[PDB]
Design a protein around this nucleic acid. Structure first.
Length: 293
DNA sequence: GTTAGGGTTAG
């Protein structure tokens, strides 16, 4: 007989392995740690209003929770509860498995996971719906900022399509992306070498200022280097910076986009599959834009 | 086994 027991987040105890359900309040998408594994940090909350920060490690990128945005709902199996500096934290245990769901009321309930075999019952449905009901009142909806609405200096998550990639100087790497709308000020343009840029050059040229240049640094470089041109991405905590003085000390205006080193605040990149509803909307904006350009 | 242990670079 198989019957999973889920422990409310306020009833957790150190030195135990449990199963839990929660709403994602914060998360760092999978990233290669200094150690052996990819790592994803996820802070979840449930109806008891207690928050639990989970440190999840796996040698396989796909084995970590497939979370696309805050508000997503997760089901974790085999989560070990321990105490770190008098603080209880969750961490992956052997056989750890997760299912992730959209967190908005009335949304399809389609479990996302890399697991080949997984338990999914009517009981799970009720649990997900209950968290969505709870969340609608104790959390904020999800809002997708387009490039035409970005402010001079702010951090934001960008949903876009990758059009080009270019090595720069090793410590940084260029991603040329677009979302179908134009920034309020022209994007800065990183000086690139000739044959270095990979992607449809003529398409990029025709789009003009519809594309923006994003420079990613340090740990973000190997991830950027591996991206497939044409794929859809969510770049978390991208940073805009209005530049009003160039390197030659001339006054001007351009908008810079940086994905700074480190993983604080979720800075990172996750490839969005075409099965993602946000990608469906994006494709239409791209088609509309393409006709004009 | 370690990793990381949320809480913005400073290019």
């Amino acid at each position: 007989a198989t019957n999973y027991i889920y422990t409310p987040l306020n009833q957790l105890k150190g030195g135990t392995i449990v199963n839990v359900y929660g709403v994602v309040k914060f998360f760092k998408p999978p990233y290669l740690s200094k150690g052996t594994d990819y790592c994803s940090v996820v802070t979840i909350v449930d109806q008891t209003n207690v928050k639990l920060t989970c440190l999840l490690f796996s040698g396989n990128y796909e084995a970590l929770p497939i979370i696309y945005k805050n508000g997503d709902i997760v089901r974790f199996h085999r989560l070990k509860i321990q105490v770190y500096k008098k603080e209880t934290q969750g961490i992956t245990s052997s056989g750890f498995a997760s299912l992730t769901f959209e967190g908005t009321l009335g949304a399809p309930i389609i479990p996302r996971t890399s697991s080949k075999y997984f338990n999914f019952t009517t009981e799970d449905h009720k649990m997900v719906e209950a968290l969505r009901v709870w969340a609608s009142t104790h959390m904020s909806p999800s809002t997708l900022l387009k490039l035409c609405d970005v402010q001079p200096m702010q951090y934001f998550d960008l949903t876009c399509q990758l059009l080009g990639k270019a090595e720069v100087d090793g410590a940084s790497f260029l991603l040329k992306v677009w979302d179908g709308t134009r920034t309020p000020f022209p994007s800065w343009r990183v000086l690139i070498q000739d044959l270095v840029l990979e992607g449809d050059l003529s398409h990029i040229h025709r789009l003009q200022n519809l594309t923006i240049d994003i420079l990613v640094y340090d740990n973000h470089v190997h991830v950027a280097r591996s991206l497939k041109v044409g794929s859809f991405l969510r770049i978390y905590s991208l940073h805009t910076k209005l530049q009003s003085m160039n390197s030659e000390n001339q006054t001007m205006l351009s908008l810079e986009f940086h994905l700074h080193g480190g993983t604080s605040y979720g800075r990172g990149i996750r490839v969005l599959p075409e099965s993602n509803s946000d990608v469906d909307q994006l494709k239409k904006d791209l088609e509309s834009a393409n006709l004009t350009a």
